[PDB]
């Protein structure tokens, strides 16, 4: 565990995180994909080898020992805001139950769901409060990673909101 378990924000790309594993933002075939997935496919090649997984669900593949979180939140263009709800819930438990199997003390995460399967809405708040609801219990320091600069605020914010 971490001697004192924070939760930071960093705006940069998630491939040059400066923790000890990553979540992907995957799609559910394990393709290379846009945005968070194809940074994830360009630095981490080896881990996209059968890391295919469904809705909801989190699938771990090493590249060399180094972990790749395949973490699959919902497309709101398909679900319902009710099923996606609970679909985006889930992918994150799923996140903290590999983070704690894996004994690992800090962990890369990008808000799931909040890009091109947000179905075009604002997701940052929801996908936040999934993300802390899962987190809140493991030990590992977590860093969550941004790419906007007033996302970056509010995500802030909402760190420091909790103290
Ligand atoms: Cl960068
Ligand atoms: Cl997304
Ligand atoms: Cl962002």
Redesign the pocket.
């Given at each position: 565990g971490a001697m004192a378990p924070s939760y930071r924000v960093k705006?940069?790309?998630i491939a040059?995180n400066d923790e000890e594993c990553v979540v992907n933002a995957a799609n559910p075939r394990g393709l290379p994909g846009d945005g968070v997935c194809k940074a994830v496919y360009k630095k981490w090649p080896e881990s996209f080898k059968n890391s295919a997984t469904p809705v909801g669900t989190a699938k771990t593949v090493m590249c060399g020992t180094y972990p790749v979180i395949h973490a699959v939140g919902p497309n709101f263009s398909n679900y319902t805001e009710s099923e996606g709800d609970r679909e985006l819930a889930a992918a994150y438990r799923e996140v903290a139950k590999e983070v704690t199997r894996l004994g690992v003390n800090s962990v890369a995460i990008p808000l799931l769901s909040t890009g091109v399967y947000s179905g075009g809405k604002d997701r940052l708040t929801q996908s936040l409060n999934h993300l802390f609801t899962a987190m809140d219990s493991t030990d590992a320091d977590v860093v969550i990673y941004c790419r906007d600069k007033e996302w970056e605020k509010k995500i802030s914010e909402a760190i420091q909101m909790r103290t």
């Open positions: 705006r940069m790309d040059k």
